[PDB]
Amino acid sequence: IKRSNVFAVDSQIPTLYMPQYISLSGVMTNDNQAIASFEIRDQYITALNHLVLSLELPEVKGMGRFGYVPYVGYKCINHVSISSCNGVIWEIEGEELYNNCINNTIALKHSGYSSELNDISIGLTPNDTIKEPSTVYVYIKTPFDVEDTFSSLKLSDSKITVTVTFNPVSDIVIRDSSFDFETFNKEFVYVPELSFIGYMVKNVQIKPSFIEKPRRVIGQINQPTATVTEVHAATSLSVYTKPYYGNTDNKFISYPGYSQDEKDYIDAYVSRLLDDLVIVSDGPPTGYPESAEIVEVPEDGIVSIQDADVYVKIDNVPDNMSVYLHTNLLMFGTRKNSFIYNISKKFSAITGTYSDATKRTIFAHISHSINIIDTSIPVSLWTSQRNVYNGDNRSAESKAKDLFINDPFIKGIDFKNKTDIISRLEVRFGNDVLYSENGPISRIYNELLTKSNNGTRTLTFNFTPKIFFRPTTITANVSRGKDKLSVRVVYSTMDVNHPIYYVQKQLVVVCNDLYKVSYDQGVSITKIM
Amino acid sequence: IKRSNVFAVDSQIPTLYMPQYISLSGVMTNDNQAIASFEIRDQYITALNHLVLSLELPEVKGMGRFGYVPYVGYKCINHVSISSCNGVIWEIEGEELYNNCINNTIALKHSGYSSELNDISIGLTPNDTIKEPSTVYVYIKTPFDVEDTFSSLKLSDSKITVTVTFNPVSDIVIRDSSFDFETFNKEFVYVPELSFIGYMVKNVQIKPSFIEKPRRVIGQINQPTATVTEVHAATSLSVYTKPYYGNTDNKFISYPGYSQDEKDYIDAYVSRLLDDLVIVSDGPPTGYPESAEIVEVPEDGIVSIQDADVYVKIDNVPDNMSVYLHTNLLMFGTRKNSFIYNISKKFSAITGTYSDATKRTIFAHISHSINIIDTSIPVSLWTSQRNVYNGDNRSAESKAKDLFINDPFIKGIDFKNKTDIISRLEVRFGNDVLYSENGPISRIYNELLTKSNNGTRTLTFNFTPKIFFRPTTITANVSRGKDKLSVRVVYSTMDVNHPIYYVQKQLVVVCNDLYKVSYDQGVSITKIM
Amino acid sequence: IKRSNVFAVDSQIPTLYMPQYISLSGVMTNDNQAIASFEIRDQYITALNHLVLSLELPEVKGMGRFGYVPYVGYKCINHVSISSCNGVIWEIEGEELYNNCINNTIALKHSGYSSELNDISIGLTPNDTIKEPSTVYVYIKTPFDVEDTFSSLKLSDSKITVTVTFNPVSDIVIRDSSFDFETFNKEFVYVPELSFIGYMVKNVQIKPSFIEKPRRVIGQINQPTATVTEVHAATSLSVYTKPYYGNTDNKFISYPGYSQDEKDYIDAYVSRLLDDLVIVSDGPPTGYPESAEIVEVPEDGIVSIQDADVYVKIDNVPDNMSVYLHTNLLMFGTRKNSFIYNISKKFSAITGTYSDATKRTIFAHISHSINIIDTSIPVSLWTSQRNVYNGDNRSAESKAKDLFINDPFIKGIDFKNKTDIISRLEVRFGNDVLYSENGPISRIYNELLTKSNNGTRTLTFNFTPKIFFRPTTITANVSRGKDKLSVRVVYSTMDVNHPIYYVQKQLVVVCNDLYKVSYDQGVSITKIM
């Protein structure tokens, strides 16, 4: 019995090298999209990987409510490209980069995720500081990071250029109307610095490698189809939907800030609704539109709103004041005398205590049925032409606290991507059906295999180890016409009298193509056919 | 100096294959245990792994309090078996499957763990919907998943059958007496679908492999011994205890629902006790049994309960009402005039405010010594024959809110498996002592080595990589009689006047046997001797 | 096309061995530092790894406030050494051991991290039990654990000695002045037990290996320099700063106990300040020093404190009482009529309700600007000679609740190591500059590469797999004088009128040297040159 020794190893002497952390400042150029270019030319840098982008956010002064989106560093990136003299080596969109890093909690934390950055801070005077200057770090994960020095990008005596395109500053900022965003936008400038790990290698022996480069296709607005052409060697395919808020002003009622659970979203929304829902006043409350229906709460504390009973009990109400309930705070309906969507009927029990000192109701326990979709409705959709009612019956004070939100990486139709609006998915390679499903079993598989919490519907064709094998791909057959991937979905049917029915959707299809990387005459890549 | 190249690899071309996600519907057969069978016969399916079971839970309508246990998908599974024409290939119990997946947070989340499923929802009218229809996904982790395609189950032109046995629906449901469980049970049916990843391989070269199959032995009620016979090649051995609630009605006072921390359990329990503990009333409170001792709280706010001082201060008590304290809410004792277990004496400070509108006391800060064992006591044990007192002096209203809980995967004597009731463990291989310990150092080691939070006392005999080596086992010596593993424990001594002393216990011993998998004449396994 | 089989393996038969868990009691010897020695001499133990130290903490009785620091098991360890007959094989400081385990959440949990151990418990009578006896487990991670049996420490027929030096018990205890620490210290004794996994190997074939041993250098108080000499083969270098609280009594105002988030620290601090900040009294509040400035809150609820407006609104104040605000609770300043640091001016809105029953103010919402540095100020620094004011104007009651905290593993100048006090870092190998940076990009890299949340500024020179290659090092050139590593930093500039400016700092430099491990004539190590 010849036995393999599992208590000792014969240590290999590795290639002689020395690593170094290297920072570079960029050249910035500019609706004038901001672009940073970083030039890497150094004869003693043989390979590199682990790119990190530094961004200095400035001091924010003035009046209004201002905050940064979570993961602001990732969300300010529109596009990243690595090139040489022979053309582009590897590139990615900001959405797909953020997708690839969504499971790296450390990287997400470094890119800007804290109370200081992401709470909605309030400025009271034109000289009040709303945010202090800060620095975020964006880990640009590339295929050259999977196996450390084995997968690194070798600079075969070539000059490597890294180009970063930035999103407009309105994408990364949550603000109210009181904040002077025009001035802020005129003054804001991205200040980037690029870091990487370089390797000074002694007598490097270079071999050709393989690289996967994502390619992204967005369908037209509300179409259930998208197609990616010229597919010859794909390792994976993923499909998801994005909301198109272009038909709105991008104003929402609430945003939970640094708290990012579904419960947190719902709590912020309910908190914003309670100030206009239950009113303690001397006589009929004033300052609400004519369409508002404010009723007094009887001695039994129960108000009926057409099949719905709301239980209101407030402590310490003065003897000259009564408790009032808003029975149609937000209303939606497409036909005049049919079903109505009423945000007031989603409450069952409201208790609290009136404060004589601050003249407010401090709410204690609330029983309600608000979900994430309601927190995700845009304010424009409550008052669209299709609504036969006056949708928004809130006070002017609460109307003034709505927030502009322009986050570019939102999936689905809600902030959490919690509702699945795809009820059937079909993929075709050429004309034949490659995959079909009704439930999200492919998303279950993507999450199980990548150990992620925010998976998408994904067909993965590669199950081999990463760089020590050539990746397994679905291969084209141009003779039989199998050279394109077509995706058709069936959207989940929503009620025509729910405002979320009118959020516009786009289908996104991402394809990972296989490329050969060769190192004769500098660095170059060729698409595998 | 010959140096190993650590900056380049020679990529191997792997076996030509194509993966595919495959779903199957089953054949259901039926105290009529429900059994689902899934048949896999497909000539182009060469291998498979990554089994996922889909379960559609129906709409739940009616009155009462209803909820699902956490991880309902895992808890509805009694047994899973994979077979071919030559017999069983691999099988497992539901408890051990859940044990093997306890460290996979993604899988646990997919099997049904959310507020919507696990809050105890309340139905008010016979047409109220308590739960909406939902789908859960149970990842059935098999030994064929450890190394992706290397460890996959090859179908040597054989038909593979997957059989799932389900637990009764009462195991996965938390309910009160007001819910119509008889009708619910008559109507509930499991609707399962089986998914796996199949591989269509071109010219597969098959080699024999090794597989570990768990074998489970449960000792008799309250015996400190269990033995597993016919042990010839075990890779690991684990020991834990389970509570036997068969001598009870399985009713408990509280359950925290979706919150699953120890603090959450304790908070739910204290919340259920406070409504009968402190009473604001006009005169001596009514509606309590004769054995209740309700005393008025003096001006200093301190009530003495035999060496115990409770500090009660309630704000806003009306002038016609007084504050009362329940001094023997739950009581236990075995001898008439000796030590008594009194749930009231476990409180030291109770403060709150009376609400005139809702006629309740809203409690603020509470100081207490309630632990997890108290939340884990069954209501039947408070009123057993051995209790010389009337144990339960609660109001009928609170008595009506007790929950039936029949969770099948509970370990220890509390819901969290927090108390260790094993004070000494001894394992014998044959007649010789193989292992001995007093503290839980083997559980510490199991958690450290498996990177788990819910480890058990485990002897692992294998420290070699998984599939690239033959596993290391403890080998039998039938000549010397070393062919069985005997386990004897010494239980921690509990006080005879604590009700948890009378919870019945079973010892569970799990043994992982090594099997050879061969592929001539289809798939077959043979026990290593 | 020769294809590598990725669906089958040729299983290797490994070395024949049998593992066993082994516990040992020690020999304890003793300002009399406690030292435990464990002797391992057993002919059938061929290798070992995975050391775990058991510690029994006793019952704590008496009066006062008492608690254990988080991770008490790690914090009681001063030094660990593994030796043979040829000298020390491997050793480490307690700080660096805890650093190496900071990312192992399971190990941190096992070493003592729970509400029961880490809440500040209160003893009321001299016989009250503050803490029950408990056992913690400290995983002593060694280089012999990285690759299981491949990296294990082989005992070439040698006797191995493990020696543990313990910190004084005052390092692991958080206490007030009311606790009798002199008696506690006279009675406390460490009771340790050592566990490891031993391997009984049949015909072991031993080969020489490599090991990295940390070496630690602490700079002098407040010097921005430190140097590690005799550096010939280092795999990594890390730099951080520690606070020196020797010029204080180590008393702080608050400690959050088991809650260990920055928000938790701030909340505990604000809670301790509110009792003296806002006072509901009949007339000017009494019991405060003469330097206190207590003003009555006007009808509009706004008090001005030199450019700062505090909004105070308390409900249910009796008609004979008024609301008062402490305008200089904690004050600091170095010049008589210049800038002042006033803890009262860091509040903007204070609301709450007075309780007539308990005669206290129960605070509801608070708006403030307290940060982690304020919670990290020592009480001695408020009343130093450099303060031209009476710094601490709190009541005697709150002064009596300050806690002694002597935690030995604190980094930076705050409890969370959140503020970076290093604005520039330079490393020199010999006289040449090896590395330079202004921001913490090296800490970003350390966290990204080690997947940690508490990284330090680190230069790592090794990117090769751990034990199957010889590690890559930065190599000395004694001819050119490159045989020492010098570190110089520039500290962040703090305001001279902030008390945190006067916390003393030490620079810590840790170097990982490469050693050869050989097994002829027992175990021995030699420093690589």
Residue numbers in the entry:
A (entry chain B), B (entry chain A), C (entry chain C): 16 to 45, 49 to 547
What's the paper's own text on this?
In Vaccinia virus (VACV), copies of the double-jelly-roll protein D13 bind to the viral membrane via interaction with its partner protein A17 and assemble into a scaffold surrounding the viral membrane. This process leads to the formation of a spherical immature virion (IV). D13 adopts a double-jelly-roll structure composed of 8 antiparallel β-strands.
Under the same conditions, the D13 protein with an N-terminal His6-tag and an extended linker (28 amino acid residues) assembled into spherical particles with an average diameter of approximately 340 nm, revealing a distinctive honeycomb-shaped pattern. These particles clearly resemble the size and shape of the authentic VACV IV scaffold described by deep-etch electron microscopy. To investigate whether the N-terminal tail α-helix is indeed responsible for this observation, we determined the structure of the His6-tagged D13 protein at 2.6 Å resolution by cryo-EM. As expected, the N-terminal tail helix feature was absent in the reconstructed map. The spherical particles in b were sometimes imaged as concentric shells containing several layers, or incompletely closed structures.
